[PDB]
Amino acid sequence: FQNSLLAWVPCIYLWVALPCYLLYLRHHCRGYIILSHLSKLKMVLGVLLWCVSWADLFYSFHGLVHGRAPAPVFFVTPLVVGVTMLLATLLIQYERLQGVQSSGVLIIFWFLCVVCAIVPFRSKILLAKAEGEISDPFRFTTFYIHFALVLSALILACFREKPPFFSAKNVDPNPYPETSAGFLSRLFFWWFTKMAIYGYRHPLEEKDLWSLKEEDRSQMVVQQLLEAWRKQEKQTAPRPRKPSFLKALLATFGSSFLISACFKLIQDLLSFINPQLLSILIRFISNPMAPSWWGFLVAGLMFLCSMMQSLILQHYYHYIFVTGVKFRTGIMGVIYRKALVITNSVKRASTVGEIVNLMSVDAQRFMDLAPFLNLLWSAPLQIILAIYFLWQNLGPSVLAGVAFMVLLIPLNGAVAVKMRAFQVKQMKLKDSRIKLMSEILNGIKVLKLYAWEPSFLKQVEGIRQGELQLLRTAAYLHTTTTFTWMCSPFLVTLITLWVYVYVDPNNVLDAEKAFVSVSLFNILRLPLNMLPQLISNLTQASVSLKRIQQFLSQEELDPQSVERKTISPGYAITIHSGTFTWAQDLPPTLHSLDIQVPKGALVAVVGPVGCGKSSLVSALLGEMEKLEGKVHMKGSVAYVPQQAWIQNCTLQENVLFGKALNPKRYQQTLEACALLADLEMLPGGDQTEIGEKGINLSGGQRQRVSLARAVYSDADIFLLDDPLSAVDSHVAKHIFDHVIGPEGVLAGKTRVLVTHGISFLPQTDFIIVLADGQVSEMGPYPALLQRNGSFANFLCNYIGTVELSVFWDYAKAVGLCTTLAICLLYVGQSAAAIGANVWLSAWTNDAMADSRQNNTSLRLGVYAALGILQGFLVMLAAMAMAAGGIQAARVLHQALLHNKIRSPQSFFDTTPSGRILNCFSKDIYVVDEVLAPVILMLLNSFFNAISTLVVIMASTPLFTVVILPLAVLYTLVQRFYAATSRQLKRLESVSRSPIYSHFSETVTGASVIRAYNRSRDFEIISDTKVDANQRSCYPYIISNRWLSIGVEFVGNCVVLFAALFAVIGRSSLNPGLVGLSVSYSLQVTFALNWMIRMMSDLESNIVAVERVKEYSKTETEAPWVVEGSRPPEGWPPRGEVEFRNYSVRYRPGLDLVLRDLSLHVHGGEKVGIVGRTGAGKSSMTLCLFRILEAAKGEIRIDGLNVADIGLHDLRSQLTIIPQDPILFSGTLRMNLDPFGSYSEEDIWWALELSHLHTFVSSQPAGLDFQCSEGGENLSVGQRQLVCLARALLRKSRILVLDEATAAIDLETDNLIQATIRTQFDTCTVLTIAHRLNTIMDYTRVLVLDKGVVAEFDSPANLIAARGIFYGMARDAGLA
Ligand SMILES: C[C@]12CC[C@@H]3c4ccc(O)cc4CC[C@H]3[C@@H]1CC[C@@H]2O[C@@H]1O[C@H](C(=O)O)[C@@H](O)[C@H](O)[C@H]1O
Ligand SMILES: C[C@]12CC[C@@H]3c4ccc(O)cc4CC[C@H]3[C@@H]1CC[C@@H]2O[C@@H]1O[C@H](C(=O)O)[C@@H](O)[C@H](O)[C@H]1O
């Protein structure tokens, strides 16, 4: 304060200039100054002046070493200049979105900046240069740079701004509240409040999100990127390398990535202020003479400079996540414009699944790279400028310090890539298990209709046990991610202290280096343990951008192949010298073809299969490339692919397909195609969802849908490529009569047809034959009838939060003896760490007057033995918790499965089995291995934060009052976030998939999308469907920030109230305890924002356990073993069946199926049940095996009831032929005997009796032959022969046949009936009536009427009585 004390003229000015002036920017609202690059320069030069105002500040702090404490006004005024011009930069950025033609105050700002500088300048311009050479070199260079930059600021402020052209108040949806938001309210992210309130008192549905801001509508961002890629042309203005996606991607985000480097720089280069004020405070309290206001100022400025660096960081993640989302959109939308205009040979070259995999992967790989990408230059600058401080403050003993972190990184990458093969590439066991789960789910019926369930229980338990034995070795080595985060700080401190002590004996320890080091390492190791993730994402994203660049350099034949301007009059379809080839390396399918077609007539193309008929239509659409020839298409086009294309939406727009709904015309098209017959089946009618979403409409129906689309779209030329392949003749003829032919609606259309039919030919106006891709004849049908030349060839040829109870339940799964040995053991480890630190504190203070310094050889020792325990009593937690997790997964899966098979048939009847299949796939993988590490890290961060909040308390025992707000505010903000972020996570996960589902539907229908020139009006459906994703992924990004302003505010009030309370009790403390209490208070604002990044992430994964508890306790009601009351065995041979008024229904509350049925059956009595087909005799078959339980009456077999026996002993003594013979996927060994209890000779003998011995003998392995999924690789007759072989093996004395003639071939049905007559002559046989011809043979027959018996009699006598049996026998034409 000698001559430059006046430098405070500008600063305080702002603190009165800002508020009063700011109101002028609020009374007038919009303004919207346009951004000229002069504004960008005005911004960035402020940042440069800021960095020099940092350089002089750390030159002032350099005085800390070499002897003196800094002079009073040296470490205050540069740091107020460097916050005032930060405010200047922020105000520039804010008026960038305002409307001031000129400031009127910032002008005075710069004027006074020059005024307060020239007078000091005039006093040293000649008083320091001619006197010598030194002239306070750094302090003078600072003035020189400041002078140059302020002169630039003045000359840039001499300008004037353009007229506001402010705005027009267009619409009032929910606007994205960054526009129309005060500067002070867009700094603390406070404008999000008005939604976080509504995210906790209400549910959120899509209509209540932000209406996305006008900059990004997914088509003003893909426009820029696509144009930049266009700038990568051949560049008319070396090695062929012209394609360069990276250059064009970089050249369109400079204004959003170099604005996001003037924040990370300011932040990290600013965060090194706290580890210097800490040394200042420690040095202060060590001196009991300095006035207390010095300490108060240092504390109150520590808080400010540790908050304003926490507000130019949590205001940087916003700008570096919005850019990630902009990547994820700009690529998802430029991958699309190419996917619409590919050449179908390229589509042949790959699979549509991987064309999708260019999204959800390789394009979602970005936005997972943007947060880390900026770290490339931060990692050195946050190291080489943080190694300097330690090497300046602990001597060259920090070599080992950072060396341990550097060594850790490869040893944290190796045992993270070992999992990339030992934990994901060994999960083919999971795929086999889920395929087996789908195998035993689809077909559970037949498996339950008789025995063999426990065999499959064991056969899935084997793979479960194997894969869990694997995981025992796959989570044990997942305890190297807790080792880092809760042993690297302590261990590196131990190593560096040990080396520093034992390098020389005359460099004694003291607080102002040990504690500043232990607090500066904390700053060092956040942007150093997130380095392995960077080095992995760079690899797995450079592998991705390579593939994206590859897929974007392909072939497009759109520009011109079939011109549409000049057409010969009187002709509509004309080709001259038409040569068409599918691929340049393929033979030419069509050779110099010359086809001319008139206007409005009918033309068809005939010939052998694939001789050019399935290629001409492709060539006409311009899809197929041409070597020579001229084609002239006139007007609109319609095209019906052989493989119908159906959009995953409602049928009405699947037929409307983007045109105005004409009602009468729409129903005319619907009725002409005769879709009404199918339409009546649809529940929602024309508004029913269609496609992958729901019912798999038959190709014979989807072809009708596509034809209706074509005819409604009333184009002028129709192309038909075998549109009646699965459409039956009786309906196809009417389709042609009402639509295609001149008698149809399309009389005045230039229709073209590709056919394999015959009766369609005679009424055709014009026929062209084709063969070998070369035309051979042409003309009207009679011209080809009499010739019988080329035509003869084909003439002959053809939501609330989870309740706490669930958590306890999970603990019960882990085992209380373990889950009570973890929380206790973490308490132990926290005690060990807090003891180690409070021991280091008592080590530091000893050096003040220690007259026996040899004691320093002891403390260090016990330090190791006080933290190695903590470095070993957390491994005993992580290993034990991994073991508990795998054990809990084992027990939970065992219970879920072991209970689900036993569930009654009704459950699988009502449940859409695929939902059961999502479990064993997703809702148990989550429980298995993405919930135990989450437990580890949650329960680990919690005990890392309790250690801090207890150590600060124990060090400075007086700030107990302040912890009450520091808890109530924290829990309040955590509750609000846990509501809103969870809601948004759900609402974004819901809408993520429909993007990918809308893709994989346009690549396949690439050709169908064209030929209606609807491609252009089809991106506007793609981009709106990613806009509906973005508007639920922006607020998530600005809801994970508004938390970290209500957290990194508490985590800094705890720094203010640690330092200030240390100062207020200076006389009662020592430097060691204060260094401890401040060094860990500075560290808590990270270990307390890391305890919400997971305590609100586990809340979205514990739900899995919830589901695995809802899919249980489902009334097994199937006691298989009642051994105390076994029936006497060996009662097939008696073979007596006796119903006694047995009354049964499907479910309690459902209709009554059977009504007091009674019967009298003896051994060998072949009996069939007759009645009305569809009455539910299958229900009676199910009752025989107790699939449905009676409410009255019972079934007595040989004097033995069915309700007093275990289910398996019951079902084992019977024999069934299921109506659908299923074939378990795999060998024939288990498909005949999963238990393998029947010898090879018996099985071969029975297969000989099965009359499939020839086919299996022809097979190489015979019984070891592999069966495809659902037994698809064997013929139908083979399936029935397999099921009857299954029946033959067991060979009981009771048979009950079940409708083996649903849609089963008769040629093998004769064999089945003959066999079951032959070998089953000594067994009681039931039979369900699907045919009256073959039931005229059994000795006796049951007559049944939906639950009431009529008689037991022979068919010869039943027709004589002239009853229902006779009526139905006569209705079949047999009497
Ligand atoms: C990258 C993350 C943010 C920044 C942290 C970070 C920054 C810099 C740095 O050098 C190191 C680290 C360490 C770990 C990083 C966090 C992991 C998940 C999160 O990533 C995103 O967070 C978003 C949000 O809530 O804003 C979520 O919305 C997104 O879904 C999520 O992907
Ligand atoms: C980033 C982590 C989760 C969140 C914590 C966090 C969040 C927000 C925040 O502001 C600060 C911090 C501090 C440290 C962060 C953790 C370190 C490793 C972990 O990240 C790991 O990555 C693993 C992988 O994908 O291979 C996954 O298993 C898990 O996500 C996890 O184990």
Side-chain angles (χ1 to χ4, degrees):
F1 47 90
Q2 279 83 20
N3 269 288
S4 294
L5 57 93
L6 188 153
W8 293 59
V9 175
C11 67
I12 48 154
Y13 182 76
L14 277 297
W15 314 126
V16 76
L18 181 43
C20 294
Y21 159 67
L22 192 86
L23 277 296
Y24 196 91
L25 297 83
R26 306 309 305 123
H27 191 197
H28 304 269
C29 190
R30 281 79 62 195
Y32 184 46
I33 297 169
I34 185 64
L35 187 151
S36 303
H37 294 293
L38 61 87
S39 166
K40 187 174 187 184
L41 179 144
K42 200 159 271 290
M43 185 185 217
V44 71
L45 284 198
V47 174
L48 287 176
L49 188 154
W50 194 95
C51 65
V52 66
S53 172
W54 170 83
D56 68 339
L57 182 52
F58 279 168
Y59 189 90
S60 166
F61 283 163
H62 183 106
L64 186 152
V65 74
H66 297 121
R68 82 209 63 72
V73 57
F74 286 357
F75 55 89
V76 65
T77 186
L79 185 53
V80 68
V81 162
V83 60
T84 43
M85 292 188 165
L86 260 179
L87 184 139
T89 300
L90 275 171
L91 192 138
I92 289 299
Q93 198 163 8
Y94 167 72
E95 61 87 19
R96 161 201 145 179
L97 283 72
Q98 271 316 126
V100 298
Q101 63 280 345
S102 81
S103 78
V105 178
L106 185 151
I107 301 299
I108 286 295
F109 176 76
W110 293 124
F111 168 74
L112 280 184
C113 278
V114 175
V115 165
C116 72
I118 280 296
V119 186
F121 189 81
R122 187 56 58 199
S123 53
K124 64 182 181 293
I125 175 61
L126 73 165
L127 276 78
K129 45 163 66 178
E131 284 72 11
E133 189 177 2
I134 55 170
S135 82
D136 61 5
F138 283 88
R139 322 291 270 174
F140 204 110
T141 51
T142 298
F143 264 90
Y144 182 76
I145 292 303
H146 183 7
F147 198 39
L149 293 204
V150 69
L151 263 292
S152 166
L154 273 296
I155 67 179
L156 264 293
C158 196
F159 300 168
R160 206 155 284 103
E161 199 47 42
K162 314 304 296 176
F165 65 95
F166 63 98
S167 280
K169 322 163 162 65
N170 306 114
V171 288
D172 56 353
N174 286 87
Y176 165 69
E178 203 177 341
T179 81
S180 76
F183 159 77
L184 183 61
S185 49
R186 73 155 77 186
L187 204 49
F188 296 134
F189 274 135
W190 201 68
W191 55 260
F192 180 70
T193 291
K194 203 45 68 185
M195 184 182 141
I197 290 307
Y198 203 69
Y200 155 83
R201 322 265 315 163
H202 277 84
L204 292 175
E205 54 174 30
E206 274 275 17
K207 67 182 290 294
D208 212 334
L209 277 296
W210 315 130
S211 62
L212 192 56
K213 68 188 293 184
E214 274 56 31
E215 184 272 351
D216 170 23
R217 323 300 280 299
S218 173
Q219 70 93 27
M220 289 156 227
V221 61
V222 72
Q223 185 37 245
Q224 283 150 226
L225 198 154
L226 185 55
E227 171 55 31
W229 171 259
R230 296 294 169 70
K231 249 81 177 172
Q232 192 268 309
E233 74 250 31
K234 86 181 83 65
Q235 277 310 117
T236 57
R239 182 69 64 192
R241 53 206 204 81
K242 314 314 194 298
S244 80
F245 194 51
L246 187 47
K247 177 196 169 86
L249 185 60
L250 288 188
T252 186
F253 286 115
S255 164
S256 163
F257 205 90
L258 282 72
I259 192 169
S260 176
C262 82
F263 289 166
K264 176 82 173 215
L265 190 78
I266 277 168
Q267 173 264 311
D268 63 358
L269 185 152
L270 200 157
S271 76
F272 286 27
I273 297 298
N274 302 158
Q276 298 304 107
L277 274 70
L278 164 66
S279 171
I280 293 299
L281 198 69
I282 293 178
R283 177 180 271 90
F284 156 71
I285 295 170
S286 179
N287 170 280
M289 306 326 283
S292 297
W293 68 260
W294 189 328
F296 268 38
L297 188 153
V298 181
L301 188 153
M302 201 175 248
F303 152 75
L304 177 139
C305 204
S306 175
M307 168 156 266
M308 172 264 288
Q309 64 84 30
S310 161
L311 186 62
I312 315 291
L313 187 151
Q314 286 298 356
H315 209 301
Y316 154 72
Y317 285 153
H318 165 223
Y319 281 22
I320 199 65
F321 286 1
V322 170
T323 289
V325 167
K326 279 195 195 303
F327 283 168
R328 199 262 300 278
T329 288
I331 282 174
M332 192 181 324
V334 75
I335 199 68
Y336 197 87
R337 315 296 145 90
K338 184 64 162 183
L340 280 189
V341 194
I342 54 169
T343 297
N344 207 59
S345 173
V346 188
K347 204 183 87 195
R348 277 178 182 165
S350 163
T351 185
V352 308
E354 190 266 3
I355 305 308
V356 164
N357 264 358
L358 292 176
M359 294 182 286
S360 301
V361 165
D362 292 331
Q364 211 263 353
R365 186 63 45 70
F366 309 158
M367 72 177 287
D368 268 323
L369 186 81
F372 301 176
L373 175 47
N374 189 179
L375 191 150
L376 291 176
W377 54 255
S378 171
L381 186 134
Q382 274 275 59
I383 285 168
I384 193 66
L385 188 147
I387 193 66
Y388 160 62
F389 282 24
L390 303 167
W391 181 59
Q392 188 274 331
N393 200 357
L394 265 180
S397 174
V398 178
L399 192 169
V402 67
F404 191 88
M405 301 265 188
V406 160
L407 193 140
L408 204 70
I409 300 317
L411 280 71
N412 197 5
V415 294
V417 72
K418 277 183 181 180
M419 294 182 286
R420 304 290 51 61
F422 189 72
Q423 196 263 349
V424 297
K425 303 318 200 306
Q426 289 262 320
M427 289 314 80
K428 69 165 158 51
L429 296 201
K430 170 265 187 194
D431 291 331
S432 163
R433 188 184 67 86
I434 193 65
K435 175 282 291 183
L436 175 68
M437 271 324 296
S438 200
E439 191 275 10
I440 78 185
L441 273 170
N442 290 318
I444 175 61
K445 199 193 321 296
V446 56
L447 182 61
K448 208 159 200 320
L449 294 174
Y450 63 92
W452 293 353
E453 51 86 14
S455 282
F456 277 38
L457 274 294
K458 296 198 291 183
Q459 189 268 329
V460 66
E461 190 276 331
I463 197 157
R464 190 78 198 148
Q465 177 48 235
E467 190 277 332
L468 286 191
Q469 188 263 9
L470 180 137
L471 291 175
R472 189 180 153 103
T473 314
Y476 272 36
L477 274 49
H478 211 306
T479 77
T480 304
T481 187
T482 188
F483 162 66
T484 289
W485 292 98
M486 311 266 288
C487 281
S488 88
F490 181 76
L491 197 149
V492 73
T493 310
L494 199 165
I495 282 301
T496 183
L497 270 299
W498 186 39
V499 162
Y500 165 52
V501 170
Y502 282 169
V503 60
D504 281 331
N506 304 357
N507 57 5
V508 295
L509 188 153
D510 43 357
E512 69 274 58
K513 51 187 66 177
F515 274 113
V516 62
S517 73
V518 71
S519 159
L520 183 63
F521 283 122
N522 167 36
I523 277 175
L524 180 58
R525 62 97 166 173
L526 175 61
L528 194 48
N529 297 338
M530 311 295 266
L531 197 81
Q533 305 219 6
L534 176 76
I535 200 63
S536 83
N537 273 32
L538 265 293
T539 58
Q540 84 171 3
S542 166
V543 70
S544 291
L545 188 143
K546 183 39 75 195
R547 280 213 274 105
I548 282 186
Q549 166 53 72
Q550 174 189 311
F551 169 77
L552 280 165
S553 66
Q554 303 286 47
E555 301 80 350
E556 322 168 349
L557 281 293
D558 184 278
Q560 187 42 275
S561 74
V562 291
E563 57 91 21
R564 288 188 170 85
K565 321 298 160 308
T566 299
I567 298 91
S568 68
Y571 277 11
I573 306 311
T574 60
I575 307 193
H576 270 157
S577 309
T579 302
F580 297 92
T581 300
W582 272 104
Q584 301 276 48
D585 71 326
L586 276 175
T589 316
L590 279 299
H591 323 89
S592 69
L593 266 290
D594 292 290
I595 179 173
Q596 273 56 50
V597 179
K599 306 168 42 61
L602 180 62
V603 173
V605 167
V606 308
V609 192
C611 75
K613 46 190 61 55
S614 291
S615 67
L616 171 78
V617 62
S618 295
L620 266 294
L621 296 187
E623 175 270 358
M624 184 177 177
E625 80 254 17
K626 169 260 291 181
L627 301 192
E628 76 269 13
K630 57 182 181 292
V631 189
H632 323 281
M633 295 299 102
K634 190 162 42 63
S636 63
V637 180
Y639 157 82
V640 183
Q642 50 101 33
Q643 268 295 307
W645 181 70
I646 62 170
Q647 196 151 14
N648 269 315
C649 55
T650 188
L651 187 151
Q652 192 198 37
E653 68 183 2
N654 202 1
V655 175
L656 272 168
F657 190 75
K659 274 70 65 182
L661 162 58
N662 186 313
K664 41 191 298 305
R665 287 199 67 253
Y666 172 39
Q667 288 101 29
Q668 280 159 11
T669 62
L670 261 176
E671 69 208 4
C673 189
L675 291 173
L676 296 166
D678 200 4
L679 183 63
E680 303 278 14
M681 182 305 298
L682 277 296
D686 70 333
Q687 303 312 127
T688 307
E689 48 85 18
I690 303 297
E692 192 64 23
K693 264 197 181 187
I695 303 181
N696 295 312
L697 277 296
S698 85
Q701 290 154 329
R702 299 183 283 95
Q703 277 176 346
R704 318 165 91 227
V705 180
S706 200
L707 183 63
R709 152 203 294 126
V711 60
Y712 169 49
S713 64
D714 63 358
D716 313 291
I717 294 92
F718 281 22
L719 283 72
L720 307 178
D721 186 74
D722 290 331
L724 321 173
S725 45
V727 182
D728 302 331
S729 66
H730 165 267
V731 297
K733 50 177 199 180
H734 277 328
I735 296 169
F736 191 102
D737 303 334
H738 301 85
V739 178
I740 297 169
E743 72 282 17
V745 63
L746 300 171
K749 311 295 156 273
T750 311
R751 327 167 277 281
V752 175
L753 182 63
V754 162
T755 191
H756 282 58
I758 297 89
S759 175
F760 293 99
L761 294 174
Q763 60 278 46
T764 50
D765 173 80
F766 184 110
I767 296 313
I768 289 171
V769 72
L770 196 55
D772 318 308
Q774 285 192 9
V775 71
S776 54
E777 206 71 29
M778 168 281 314
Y781 181 43
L784 279 75
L785 281 174
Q786 274 91 25
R787 283 291 180 270
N788 282 319
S790 64
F791 175 51
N793 79 69
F794 182 76
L795 190 145
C796 302
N797 280 343
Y798 280 175
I799 193 63
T801 187
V802 58
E803 275 292 82
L804 189 150
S805 54
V806 164
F807 297 110
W808 162 259
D809 200 357
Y810 182 84
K812 171 64 155 295
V814 191
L816 269 293
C817 204
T818 294
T819 192
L820 279 179
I822 301 299
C823 184
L824 174 143
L825 188 153
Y826 273 132
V827 163
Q829 81 88 30
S830 178
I834 190 167
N837 280 118
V838 189
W839 177 264
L840 181 42
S841 178
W843 181 9
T844 62
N845 79 336
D846 211 343
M848 61 79 71
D850 186 13
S851 179
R852 211 67 185 100
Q853 293 85 300
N854 59 6
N855 182 244
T856 188
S857 167
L858 161 74
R859 281 162 192 263
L860 182 62
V862 74
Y863 197 44
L866 192 44
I868 284 300
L869 183 141
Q870 203 266 2
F872 159 87
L873 214 66
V874 70
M875 301 325 188
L876 183 62
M879 292 325 190
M881 187 64 206
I886 68 159
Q887 205 274 355
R890 171 150 76 78
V891 167
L892 205 47
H893 168 95
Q894 174 67 233
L896 158 70
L897 183 136
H898 178 281
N899 184 29
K900 196 35 54 174
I901 291 314
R902 307 201 166 62
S903 56
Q905 180 50 250
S906 311
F907 184 109
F908 295 102
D909 292 317
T910 178
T911 313
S913 158
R915 289 182 64 251
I916 295 297
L917 202 173
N918 77 6
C919 300
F920 310 112
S921 171
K922 273 294 301 164
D923 291 331
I924 197 165
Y925 149 72
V926 165
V927 160
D928 180 286
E929 77 263 48
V930 297
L931 190 139
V934 168
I935 293 294
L936 291 174
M937 213 84 67
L938 179 64
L939 213 53
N940 205 0
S941 83
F942 180 76
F943 281 97
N944 195 36
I946 301 299
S947 79
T948 290
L949 277 296
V950 174
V951 69
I952 315 181
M953 281 315 327
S955 181
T956 68
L958 196 143
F959 74 106
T960 300
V961 185
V962 72
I963 203 166
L964 179 146
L966 291 203
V968 65
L969 188 153
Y970 170 78
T971 181
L972 173 44
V973 54
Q974 205 281 340
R975 222 168 65 185
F976 281 167
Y977 167 91
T980 299
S981 169
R982 177 130 46 77
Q983 183 62 255
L984 285 187
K985 281 207 309 301
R986 191 264 310 182
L987 190 54
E988 186 276 334
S989 180
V990 175
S991 178
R992 174 200 281 300
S993 293
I995 298 168
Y996 313 132
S997 159
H998 163 90
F999 207 75
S1000 164
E1001 192 161 39
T1002 176
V1003 289
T1004 65
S1007 172
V1008 178
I1009 282 283
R1010 304 181 282 284
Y1012 295 124
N1013 83 329
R1014 189 166 162 74
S1015 161
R1016 176 43 211 171
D1017 189 358
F1018 203 82
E1019 294 83 3
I1020 321 181
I1021 297 89
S1022 180
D1023 63 69
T1024 187
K1025 212 174 277 287
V1026 293
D1027 179 312
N1029 183 15
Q1030 283 186 165
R1031 68 163 58 86
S1032 66
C1033 186
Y1034 271 15
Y1036 182 34
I1037 295 180
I1038 320 173
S1039 186
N1040 196 1
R1041 301 289 95 80
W1042 162 90
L1043 178 147
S1044 179
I1045 300 306
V1047 170
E1048 261 178 23
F1049 165 72
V1050 163
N1052 282 2
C1053 294
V1054 69
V1055 160
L1056 187 152
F1057 279 78
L1060 192 82
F1061 275 62
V1063 171
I1064 209 176
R1066 45 184 310 180
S1067 48
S1068 193
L1069 291 203
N1070 63 6
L1073 277 296
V1074 177
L1076 187 153
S1077 165
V1078 165
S1079 168
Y1080 277 165
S1081 165
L1082 189 152
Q1083 189 167 296
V1084 75
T1085 185
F1086 152 77
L1088 186 135
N1089 171 54
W1090 173 45
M1091 183 254 278
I1092 303 184
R1093 209 23 150 53
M1094 293 180 183
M1095 182 175 98
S1096 179
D1097 163 79
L1098 184 139
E1099 292 275 30
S1100 178
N1101 279 21
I1102 201 65
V1103 164
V1105 172
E1106 181 56 340
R1107 253 181 304 279
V1108 191
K1109 293 300 181 181
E1110 301 305 20
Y1111 291 167
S1112 294
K1113 63 194 83 65
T1114 318
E1115 293 83 4
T1116 183
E1117 60 96 27
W1120 299 335
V1121 186
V1122 76
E1123 284 296 323
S1125 53
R1126 292 292 87 193
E1129 295 294 328
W1131 74 112
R1134 286 288 323 286
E1136 207 171 358
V1137 179
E1138 303 293 326
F1139 279 26
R1140 292 160 179 169
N1141 43 62
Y1142 164 100
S1143 303
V1144 69
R1145 71 182 180 276
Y1146 288 166
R1147 276 175 282 174
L1150 278 190
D1151 279 352
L1152 317 183
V1153 189
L1154 180 53
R1155 305 175 298 277
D1156 291 331
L1157 183 63
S1158 292
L1159 58 85
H1160 184 231
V1161 171
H1162 287 123
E1165 291 178 343
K1166 313 185 196 302
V1167 169
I1169 306 100
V1170 67
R1172 51 171 313 279
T1173 305
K1177 314 171 189 184
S1178 59
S1179 307
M1180 181 285 318
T1181 70
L1182 265 57
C1183 294
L1184 266 292
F1185 303 81
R1186 282 177 64 189
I1187 312 307
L1188 296 174
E1189 301 328 294
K1192 186 52 153 308
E1194 61 91 21
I1195 301 163
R1196 193 81 65 177
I1197 301 303
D1198 294 332
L1200 312 187
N1201 180 15
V1202 301
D1204 48 359
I1205 181 181
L1207 271 300
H1208 280 64
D1209 193 318
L1210 185 147
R1211 309 191 183 160
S1212 53
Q1213 321 286 356
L1214 282 72
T1215 296
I1216 192 66
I1217 300 103
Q1219 63 84 30
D1220 199 349
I1222 201 65
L1223 190 53
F1224 303 120
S1225 288
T1227 182
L1228 270 290
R1229 296 290 297 272
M1230 51 155 178
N1231 269 255
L1232 277 296
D1233 188 352
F1235 294 95
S1237 306
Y1238 285 172
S1239 75
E1240 196 48 42
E1241 179 264 351
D1242 309 318
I1243 290 188
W1244 265 118
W1245 181 65
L1247 276 296
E1248 167 54 42
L1249 311 171
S1250 83
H1251 304 79
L1252 266 193
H1253 181 281
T1254 66
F1255 169 77
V1256 64
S1257 61
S1258 177
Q1259 278 302 311
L1263 282 73
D1264 291 331
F1265 166 74
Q1266 209 286 330
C1267 302
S1268 63
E1269 308 302 330
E1272 191 276 332
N1273 63 347
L1274 297 191
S1275 77
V1276 189
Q1278 293 179 356
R1279 284 152 270 211
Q1280 300 77 57
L1281 263 48
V1282 164
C1283 69
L1284 62 83
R1286 283 171 188 148
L1288 280 169
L1289 308 192
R1290 293 183 288 176
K1291 186 63 179 66
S1292 76
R1293 298 280 175 172
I1294 294 93
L1295 183 63
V1296 295
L1297 188 153
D1298 208 356
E1299 212 276 318
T1301 55
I1304 283 168
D1305 60 312
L1306 275 299
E1307 49 274 36
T1308 58
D1309 269 335
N1310 305 126
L1311 304 195
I1312 294 149
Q1313 297 282 357
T1315 45
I1316 62 170
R1317 288 179 200 105
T1318 54
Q1319 323 84 20
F1320 293 100
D1321 279 314
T1322 55
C1323 306
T1324 289
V1325 170
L1326 281 293
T1327 294
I1328 306 312
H1330 208 97
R1331 49 183 56 232
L1332 295 156
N1333 44 10
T1334 69
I1335 66 184
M1336 301 215 178
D1337 54 354
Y1338 321 112
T1339 51
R1340 300 179 68 86
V1341 168
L1342 201 73
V1343 176
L1344 166 67
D1345 171 69
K1346 313 179 306 306
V1348 287
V1349 57
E1351 202 50 34
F1352 304 82
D1353 210 7
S1354 74
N1357 298 133
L1358 294 166
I1359 54 168
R1362 299 287 194 263
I1364 309 189
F1365 176 96
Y1366 165 81
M1368 291 276 207
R1370 184 67 180 272
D1371 287 344
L1374 307 162

